[PDB]
Amino acid sequence: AAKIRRDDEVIVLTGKDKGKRGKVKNVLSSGKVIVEGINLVKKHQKPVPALNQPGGIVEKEAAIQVSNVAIFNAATGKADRVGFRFEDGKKVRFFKSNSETI
Amino acid sequence: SRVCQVTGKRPVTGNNRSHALNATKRRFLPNLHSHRFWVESEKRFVTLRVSAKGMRVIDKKGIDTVLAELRARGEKY
Amino acid sequence: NNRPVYIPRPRPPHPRL
Amino acid sequence: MKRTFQPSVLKRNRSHGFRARMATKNGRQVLARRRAKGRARLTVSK
Amino acid sequence: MIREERLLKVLRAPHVSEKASTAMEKSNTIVLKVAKDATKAEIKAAVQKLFEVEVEVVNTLVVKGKVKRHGQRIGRRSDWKKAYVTLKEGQNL
Amino acid sequence: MKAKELREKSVEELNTELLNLLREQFNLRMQAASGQLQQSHLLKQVRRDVARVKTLLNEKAGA
RNA sequence: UACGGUGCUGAAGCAACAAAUGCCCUGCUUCCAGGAAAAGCCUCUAAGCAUCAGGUAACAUCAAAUCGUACCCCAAACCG
RNA sequence: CGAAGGUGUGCUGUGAGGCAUGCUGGAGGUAUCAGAAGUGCGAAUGCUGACAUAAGUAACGAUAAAGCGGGUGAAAAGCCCGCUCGCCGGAAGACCAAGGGUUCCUGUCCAACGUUAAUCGGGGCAGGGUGAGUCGACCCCUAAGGCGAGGCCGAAAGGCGUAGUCGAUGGGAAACAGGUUAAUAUUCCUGUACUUGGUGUUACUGCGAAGGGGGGACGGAGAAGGCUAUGUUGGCCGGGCG
RNA sequence: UAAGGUGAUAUGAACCGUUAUAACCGGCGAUUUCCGAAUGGGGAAACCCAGUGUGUUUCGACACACUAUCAUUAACUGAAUCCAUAGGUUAAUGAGGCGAACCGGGGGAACUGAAACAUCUAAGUACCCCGAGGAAAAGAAAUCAACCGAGAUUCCCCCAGUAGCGGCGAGCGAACGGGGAGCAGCCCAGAGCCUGAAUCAGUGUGUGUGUUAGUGGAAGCGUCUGGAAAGGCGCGCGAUACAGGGUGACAGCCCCGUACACAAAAAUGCACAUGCUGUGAGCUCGAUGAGUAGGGCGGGACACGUGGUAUCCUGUCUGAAUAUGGGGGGACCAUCCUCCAAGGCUAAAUACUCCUGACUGACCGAUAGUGAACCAGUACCGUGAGGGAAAGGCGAAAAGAAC
């Protein structure tokens, strides 16, 4: 019963990048999600003599709180809450404000 | 142990008041004696550790009755 | 930071008697 | 200087070992007190 | 009968070291790790079946674990047993 | 696979238990020790399989 | 010779004397203070078994498991 | 567009105090009127932590002793190699038990540890290292002594003890020489031996115990004889004549 | 339940799963090494060494199970003497040990107070030992009262620091009675008549509810400051949900939740209905607890210390009546009143919290609070019993500083 899932179109509600849309890549058990292209962090990658020698500065994605993002409605062009309803015995997600199935 | 096998008498602690009322812990022991009672049911003698009072109740009540009561109590003679 | 455990017996004093 | 403590594994076990403690009731009480306090080393042993 | 799978469990791994290599090339002996108990009879039988080889004798020893100092915590390595299995003139591995 | 061998007889299920231990269990352990076992998940999979087969033997045999 | 060592070869290898606190000696000779126990071992029988079993001798074969085994040990490693 | 706290300054009250504001700080604070207290510290040879003092002072742990060259290194009185000097040599040498429990060996590191420096170490990190029919333990037997079926005794706990069963500081079967690893060997290798049991075969035979006997099985001191370990000398072999 | 997972310090490697047999949570099973009551024997705990009975590739050697003691019962055997008994073997059932307090019983201090100290107090306290339960113990009048009456026991508030006891010192200190909590009475010592005759206990089925996983769960945007708003300003919405926690500063409307409404294949608690098994109504007549009551001597408990000291209990020595009889009513006697000992069982009102859940705090906020907010009863100290610390905080996010 998680509102945010593996493949979801979400929009940032708060933070330095509020309002930019994106797709969630993965969700952490600590109530955090990773969405590509918004929370860029410049990590100084220490060089290693192993098979991989990227070194330099890497542009990674930093996880953000689940509550900081909402599913994009994609029809009203604004963030909307999502709830659960039982249909033919299968639990599904649905928007609000003219709620329609995903 | 100094326990009568008939009446169950056991040593009981107590004080010994002196002339000046001073108190010291003493112990009253039962007058136990090892006696050999003849029982016709087994046609033999059975040795018991009994007190003076115990020997009186055996003398009055039947020896068999005392043994039967003793067996019920679960003590082995 | 343990406080000294064994304190030796004081040296016997000069007899002022 | 012969100090008081002259180690000997055999004597140590036969004096304060688990089997020595359990032989008599007082030692059994000692083990019970150690368990209640939750000491890692219940007794002395290799 | 459970002797079978017991023989499949007494061997644990082979030991690799310059002494192990020297023993193999000179005395035709292979040193390998075995189970904690791993009595000589079980080791000999296991080597016979699994490696289909012939062994002159097996002599074992117990290696006590080392006390290692990780971070702020102390710990002891697990003990293990190694066996010097001696092969006859004919050997495979 | 858990119910695939639940309908097997004791003899045949005892045999596959024998094969699981002889192959893919002893050989894997040697490879891991020697360092040529690139993929380690096999050891986990085979060990669970041996346990799954073994419990069925006890569940079937006797009680 | 990675110059630490490695490999190859290899003569004579006897006699005399001295000599123990060590061995013969759990001996021997003396003295009073009179100087462990049990098993292995050897031997004789009871019950019982004696066409057996069992024992003896010879030969062959197999087994001898398990744990300790590093290092210090009159000391920088044990007790202070 | 900056709370508590911290650090200054300026005002104000008879005092304990209060108010305002600069800097630091970073998110809590609290008027007024009441209520409740772990309600106020300078002392108790007070308790805990931190930091001074003496003071860069005493000391640097046997008066067996060092010197020089070379090497490695950022750096060498202290490490490695070599040449000398000195010390122990019934020990300050070489092997064990007890007790430690990896301190063993190799690579690497020098912050801390070493009463100095440190490339060094019994220091840190990683890897390696302990091979037994014969050695020891385990095992068979027992001493002192322990425990102790029943049992005897004791308010309870428990005490004593028989049959038994434990308990080596004792008794009981068997291996030596040589070689090899950076680190183990009487354990590995080579050579040559020995002991106790199980099974089978062959030839003979009466076997058979917690039972009997023998043996095991024993003190102190002293003396002599016969030997060996071992040492010295000669011969022999090899080298040298400086 | 599920699109995410392979516990944490703690990244990685190699993999699983995504519409359902990944993972996770609950019920019921399986596995459950060795030590430990330890139970085959022994033992320096986590070790050593056996017997017996069942099954097996080289005799080789293995696998499984059993084998402690004590108590009761049964069977089979069997001494000193025929019989017999003790004894021995076998089988079945139970017990054993641990655990914070509470509970009952068996033992039982001293310090201290009295301004000394011995009777006394401290105190039937600390402590030791035994036993049992979820409570235990106590308990259906041989009781109180007063010649009016009350009707088992236990607990709370009064009576009441009263009457009394007391080197009449220090101190101890009730009862009667009144007001409440909670209520329940029965059986054996015996025969007959009538015979599942109620009430219970041990087990099934069905019903209700609870517990062990859970599910849905309403309603906000725009601007200003700022690193970031949940804040300021403006206008809205839900509420049987503004209890809480998290979210880049303070959120009813961002998330988890809460109010509220629902859900259990399986395993179980409780309350009912309905079966089986076992023990058992009711009526008549009779009986109605002897080494006991009581007494002498010595002690104890009773508020009551031997005092004029009743009452209960006991070590010791004695010893009735039995219902026309006996006990008590605070020395004792008489008259009256009351009750029927020496055989037992009994729920509730009360006591405690090792452990689990929920909630609360004019309780603490790291020298506080448990000794321990950090893998603490750890390091460390001691032969041992035992003693026993110090140590919390980067940031919203490691973005933990490439070069």
Swiss-Prot record, chain A:
One of two assembly initiator proteins, it binds directly to the 5'-end of the 23S rRNA, where it nucleates assembly of the 50S subunit. It is not thought to be involved in the functions of the mature 50S subunit in vitro. One of its GO terms (molecular function) is structural constituent of ribosome. The keyword Cell membrane does not apply. NCBIfam families: rplX_bact. Part of the 50S ribosomal subunit. Might contact the SecYEG translocation complex when it is docked with the ribosome. Belongs to the universal ribosomal protein uL24 family. This is Large ribosomal subunit protein uL24. One of its GO terms (biological process) is ribosomal large subunit assembly. Keywords: Ribonucleoprotein, Ribosomal protein, RNA-binding, rRNA-binding. CDD domains: KOW_RPL26. PROSITE patterns: RIBOSOMAL_L24. The keyword rRNA-binding applies.
UniProtKB/Swiss-Prot annotation, chain B:
It holds the Pfam family Ribosomal_L28. Part of the 50S ribosomal subunit. Keywords: Ribonucleoprotein, Ribosomal protein, RNA-binding, rRNA-binding. Gene3D superfamilies: Ribosomal protein L28/L24 (2.30.170.40). InterPro entries: Ribosomal_bL28, Ribosomal_bL28/bL31-like_sf, Ribosomal_bL28_bact-type, Ribosomal_bL28_sf. GO terms for molecular function: rRNA binding; structural constituent of ribosome. This is Large ribosomal subunit protein bL28. Belongs to the bacterial ribosomal protein bL28 family. GO terms for biological process: cytoplasmic translation; ribosomal large subunit assembly. It comes from the Bacteria. The keyword Transferase does not apply. HAMAP family: Ribosomal_bL28. GO terms for cellular component: cytoplasm; cytosol; cytosolic large ribosomal subunit.
UniProtKB/Swiss-Prot annotation, chain E:
Changing residue 18 to A: Binds normally to ribosomes; strongly reduces trigger factor binding. Signal peptide: none annotated. Pfam families: Ribosomal_L23. Transmembrane segments: none annotated. One of its GO terms (cellular component) is cytosolic large ribosomal subunit. Disulfide bonds: none annotated. The keyword Protein biosynthesis does not apply. One of its GO terms (molecular function) is structural constituent of ribosome. The keyword Chaperone does not apply. Keywords: Ribonucleoprotein, Ribosomal protein, RNA-binding, rRNA-binding. One of its GO terms (biological process) is ribosomal large subunit assembly. HAMAP family: Ribosomal_uL23_B. One of the early assembly proteins, it binds 23S rRNA; is essential for growth. One of the proteins that surround the polypeptide exit tunnel on the outside of the subunit. Acts as the docking site for trigger factor for Ffh binding to the ribosome (SRP54) and to nascent polypeptide chains. Part of the 50S ribosomal subunit. Contacts protein L29 and trigger factor. Might also contact SecE and probably does contact SecG and SecY when the SecYEG translocation complex is docked with the ribosome. Belongs to the universal ribosomal protein uL23 family. This is Large ribosomal subunit protein uL23. It comes from Escherichia coli (strain K12). The gene is rplW.
From Swiss-Prot, chain F:
The lineage of its organism: Bacteria, Pseudomonadati, Pseudomonadota, Gammaproteobacteria, Enterobacterales. One of its GO terms (cellular component) is cytoplasm. One of its GO terms (molecular function) is rRNA binding. It comes from Escherichia coli (strain K12). Keywords: Ribonucleoprotein, Ribosomal protein, RNA-binding, rRNA-binding. The gene is rpmC. Pfam families: Ribosomal_L29 (PF00831). Belongs to the universal ribosomal protein uL29 family. This is Large ribosomal subunit protein uL29. InterPro entries: Ribosomal_protein_uL29, Ribosomal_uL29, Ribosomal_uL29_CS, Ribosomal_uL29_sf. HAMAP family: Ribosomal_uL29. One of its GO terms (biological process) is ribosomal large subunit assembly. Disruption phenotype: Cells missing both S17 and L29 grow very slowly and have a rather unstable temperature-sensitive phenotype. Binds 23S rRNA. It is not essential for growth. One of the proteins that surrounds the polypeptide exit tunnel on the outside of the subunit. Contacts trigger factor. Part of the 50s ribosomal subunit. Contacts protein L23, trigger factor and protein nascent chains. Might also contact SecE and probably does contact SecG when the SecYEG translocation complex is docked with the ribosome. It comes from the Bacteria. PANTHER family: 60S RIBOSOMAL PROTEIN L35/50S RIBOSOMAL PROTEIN L29, LARGE RIBOSOMAL SUBUNIT PROTEIN UL29C.
